[PDB]
Structure formats: C-alpha cells, structure tokens
Design a protein around this ligand. Sequence first.
Ligand SMILES: OC[C@H]1O[C@H](O[C@H]2[C@H](O)[C@@H](O)[C@@H](O[C@H]3[C@H](O)[C@@H](O)[C@@H](O[C@H]4[C@H](O)[C@@H](O)[C@@H](O)O[C@@H]4CO)O[C@@H]3CO)O[C@@H]2CO)[C@H](O)[C@@H](O)[C@@H]1O
Ligand code: NA
Length: 462
Amino acid sequence: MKIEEGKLVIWINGDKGYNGLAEVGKKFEKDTGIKVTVEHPDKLEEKFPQVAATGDGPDIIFWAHDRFGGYAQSGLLAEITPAAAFQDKLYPFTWDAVRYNGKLIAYPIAVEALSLIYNKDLLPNPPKTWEEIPALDKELKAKGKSALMFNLQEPYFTWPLIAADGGYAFKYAAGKYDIKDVGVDNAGAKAGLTFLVDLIKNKHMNADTDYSIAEAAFNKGETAMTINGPWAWSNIDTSAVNYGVTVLPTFKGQPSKPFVGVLSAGINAASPNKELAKEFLENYLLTDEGLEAVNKDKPLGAVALKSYEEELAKDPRIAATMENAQKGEIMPNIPQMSAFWYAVRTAVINAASGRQTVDAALAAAQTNAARAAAASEFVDALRGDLIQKVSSVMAIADSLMSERMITDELYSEVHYADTNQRKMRLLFRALDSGGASVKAEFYRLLMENEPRLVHELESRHS
Ligand SMILES: OC[C@H]1O[C@H](O[C@H]2[C@H](O)[C@@H](O)[C@@H](O[C@H]3[C@H](O)[C@@H](O)[C@@H](O[C@H]4[C@H](O)[C@@H](O)[C@@H](O)O[C@@H]4CO)O[C@@H]3CO)O[C@@H]2CO)[C@H](O)[C@@H](O)[C@@H]1O
Ligand code: NA
C-alpha cells in the first residue's frame, strides 16, 4: 500500500520544535504500540502536494494555515470533525483560520506573529518608528554596530512594512476574500518597499541578508535589532544576549501589520491511519503536556489550546507576539495564497537587488498575482468540464514538461494514456501536485490552444 497502515509519519518544518514533537510521538507509541516518526524535509510545503496528489506522503502535515486551502482544494486533506467538547478547548479564531468552504481542514496548534527583537544593552529604548532607524544606524555604525538586520529573502519578513500603509493580499469584502482585488501595487505597498530599498541604498542594510545571516549577527551582538518569530527565541536564549521582544515600529504612523500564521496540522486524505492521527493530535499533542514538550524545544508562540495558553500568557514575549498579531491580519487560507507569496518574493528580491525599480517590481507582482489568482480559481471551478472537453491536453502537457512544472512520472502517465479525457484525468493529478501556480500556467496554455472553449466556460462560470 502507498502509505503504511499502523504507524504515523509526520512532517514539520525544521524551524519548529520537532524533537519535542518526537517526544510526544514516543508517548503515543508507549500507549498504543503505534510508532510515530517525525521528519523535517527541506521545502516540505512544496513536497507535500507532490506526493499527496499521487496518494503517498506523510499521514500528518504541519505548516501555517495559509497553505491549507490550496491543499484542501487539491483533494489532499481529510475533513476534520472534532466533537464540541474538543472544539471548545481551542480559541474560536483559531478554528476560523482552518475553516475552508464550510468545513474544518486542519487542527490549529499555535498563533505566530513577527515582533521586533532588540538588544537591551545596545538599545535600552528601541525605536517606535521605522523612520528613526537610519539615524539610529548612523549612530551605531560609529560604535562598530548596526541598527537592524532581518531576513530580506522571504516576503513574510518584509510584508509587515509593505502592509503598514496600505498594502494587502486580497481585499476582504461581502463576507469573503475578493481574488479580483489585490493590493500589492498601491501607494501604501510602494511606500513601504521604497522605505526598505532606501535602507539598502544608504547602506543601513544589505540586499543579501537572509535568515541565518540576520540570526547570527543579532545573536553575536553585532546588530541592535532583528525581526523574527517565537521559534527564534530558543537560539537567542543560548546566545546570552540581553534581549527584549516588543511592538514592531510604525510606518507613517500606522502599525506594522504582520501576516499572522496559525501553525496547523492536516491529515492526508490518502492516509489509512486517520483515526489514530486524530487521537494523536487531539489527545496527545493538543494537551497541556503535549504542547509543553514541543514548546520547550522551540517556542510555539500563543497556543491554540486555552488551558495551556494560561501558562504562557504572562510571558512578556508572548504578550508582545499577541500585540503584533492584533495589529496585523490573519492570513487568508485560500488556494491563491501561494501565488501571492511567490509574486511578492520576486518583487522584494528584485527591488532590493536593484534588478528592478520598486514601481516596476510591484507592478509586475500585482499583475502576476491577479492573473494567477483568477486563472487558478477558474481551473478549480471548472475541473469536471475541463476534463470532459479539453482537446489540446498533450500539447499542454508537453509545454508544462518543458517549464518543469510536471514530474517525469506524471508526464509519462499522460503520454501513455489513450483518449483526451483520460489524459486530462491524469493531467489534473499534476495540477493538484503543483497548486495555484501550475493551475495558472495550465490556464494560460489552454487559452492559447482553445480560446473558444475558455470563453464558453468563462461565460458559465460568471
Ligand atoms: O522558490 C522560492 C521558494 O519557494 C518556496 O517558498 C514559498 C512557499 O512555498 C510558500 O508557501 C510561501 O511561503 C510563505 C508561507 O506559506 C507562510 O506561512 C509564511 O511562512 C513563514 C511561517 O509561517 C513561519 O512559521 C516560519 O516558518 O517562517 C516562514 C517564513 O520563512 O511566509 C512564507 C513567505 O515568506 O512563499 C514561499 C516563497 O516566498 C520554498 O520553500 C523556498 O525554498 C523557495 O526558495
Ligand atoms: Na549576556
């Protein structure tokens, strides 16, 4: 069988408390005889759909909830249905984060928000505004230090500044996220990214600073500030830096607005171990003792479990995390989120490097995100019709193979399949493997090959 019955394989990111989770797994094993194996592969959030779309992969997948609507829409997750007594154990807003089209699609674990982390010996009174950072850096440079270093390679870390004065992913309106209303190139987003690029041009930051560079400099006492989440606090404790965790700086008087993630655990739709996965998550992990084991390894942030949060709430670092979360926004969980993030990543890296201007970079991200969002929604909405009607499927598959958006394995199956509908049934496995971006590219190719079909179906859709 594809997935092994009688054990649990769990994937979780290498920045989280995976040794603590493995300890919870050992407790489950001693009680049930069911072995629990915890793995942290690189790029797991991309690998998960690549294996789950073919019926393989881990039994349980951990990531922030923004990835989960895409997984659910791609047929990869089991519906979660806790009894009321269990549901009442977690904060209402955490269940909201894992609700997609009426159904719960994961168990929420903990609430993560970025904060400003500062060295209290170098900087007893951290800046309340982004605007005062250049003068602060000039001052620190005279003492052989710098003001601020944080990861500039992942848009998650720059988003709070881009959002502060008006950037947004998708507008919430009429009781839903409007995928036709993207806020990546408005004046607010441009102002925040321009502020960031100006820090780099003026040598207050370097475009190539990444996670490990910023962590190393802060934990060695070389830079006075960094921006990070709760999972980073463990290494800072070891480093002996006298650090504080506080509200992010304002920009143009507005709070920085971090995108808030809820670390969530989904169950693979293909798993033959769903009932014991539910027991593990509800009755071993989501207990005071379970979260304590994980949290002691790497801090989780503010946990979804109300009883355990009582233990954590008086920690000033957790209070700061929640202050920043309340000033930010919970991420959408919609499938289009991955396309938004890929677009914004490119924009920030290109603008920071000088490859593109801020205006050009964000204009391109806006166009690409909007186009992918609409195209992927179409593809998911009209799945049954596309499988029945698309005639150019082998040409589309050939094109996807060239741009490395489909595996040799799945391409092979499409190649050997007989008729168009059968090729399409198989090709949709590759679309479900590659998420919103591959679905968007499928749409673009289809519009090139069969414009009459696309226009006919779009009439029905709208
Ligand atoms: O090829 C470029 C890179 O592509 C891959 O990264 C993608 C992810 O696949 C996307 O999911 C998205 O990432 C988001 C992420 O979904 C979101 O939750 C948030 O991630 C935080 C996380 O919540 C927090 O717990 C902690 O782990 O830090 C994360 C930030 O590093 O923000 C992400 C966006 O920054 O977008 C990225 C690309 O930006 C792939 O993994 C990369 O290796 C690859 O280079
Ligand atoms: Na010290």
